[PDB]
Subunit: 216 residues, 2 copies
Amino acid sequence: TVPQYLKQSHERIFENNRAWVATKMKDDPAFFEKLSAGQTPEYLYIGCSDSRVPANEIMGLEAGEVFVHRNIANLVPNTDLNVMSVINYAVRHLQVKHIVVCGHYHCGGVKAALTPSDLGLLNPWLRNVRDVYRLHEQELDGIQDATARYRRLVELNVIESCRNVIKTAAVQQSFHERQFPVVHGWIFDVETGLLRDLEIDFEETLRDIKKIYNLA
Amino acid sequence: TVPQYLKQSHERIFENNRAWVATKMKDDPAFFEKLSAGQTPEYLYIGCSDSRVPANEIMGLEAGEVFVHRNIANLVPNTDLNVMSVINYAVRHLQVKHIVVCGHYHCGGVKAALTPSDLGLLNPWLRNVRDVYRLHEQELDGIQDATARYRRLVELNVIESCRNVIKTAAVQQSFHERQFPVVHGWIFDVETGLLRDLEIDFEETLRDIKKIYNLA
């Protein structure tokens, strides 16, 4: 019942992996023990499942230095145990120094969230993007250009994901008693390859959140 | 406020990104046109948040060819909207031909799931790993060596994640009506960088799942 082309495609991946390992052995033999050495990551990166470039390459780090979560539209929903487990583990167990949320403008989950279709299973997840729009409706309604409005929605979605990280007890507690981690919101431009810091202002955002949720 | 070293560390990432873009301009004339190509991924890769190497490198593919999800212990829980959204989007919208779950032996979420502690918010997520043990208790109890037992648990966790992918309506409907996608379970060996195919029987697993849930 499984077409032969899918079996060949799968077998080609294993050929590519063997070639990739051969090339790493000739060019960089130290990589395998370095890879297996055991490193604690200093970064948590939350990005889009539609990955354009691996986080560690963008950041010029080794993959073992970045704990990674990717999901549709780089969301941090309040009641998502998947992302909340990544955050609580990275802070309380790995003691990461930085949490980054990184979005991009390339048509993915955010554009999917703007299509007025019943996508069954997907509607609840994409609703979180639509709720970012509703939080910033006064700003986004006033932006005439379709591309500009879409880009600002992508930015504000990163900013609200960052807000949702900062709201976690784990981030508050750890920053109070250890001065880390700090939360950053970034945009990756696929047209230029450049990161842009959206300059979240971790401390101000934390202050605003603490108005009804001051742990100490 | 926030310590100076965190600010310096964040600043270094931006310097690395600039350097990284320079080297990509020399080595690959159309990288940034390729990076924004709009090319639809043929693979969904579900792996561990404790990533050792990017999926697309291991598989010798470009990052835009691999839709990615990473979570603690590479789980596909029934009730997790985060992972179920990644799977439903990849199948129904991207029409990926392959879904891969890939685990590895480097101490991560699986080892955390074997620590008999109250980790608050983490308990429900890590419980899924403990339930893999209980499903395969006779087999794992028969393995005397701690490292061998741990390794087999990591493999069975990949296998059960793959079974949870195959159980999705999206995978069954699409495979019935179009003969794709196929699901594969892999182990990445950090010592050698080689993939190992766990040879999950997609046809047999789909046949077993269909006994009470035959879509057509």
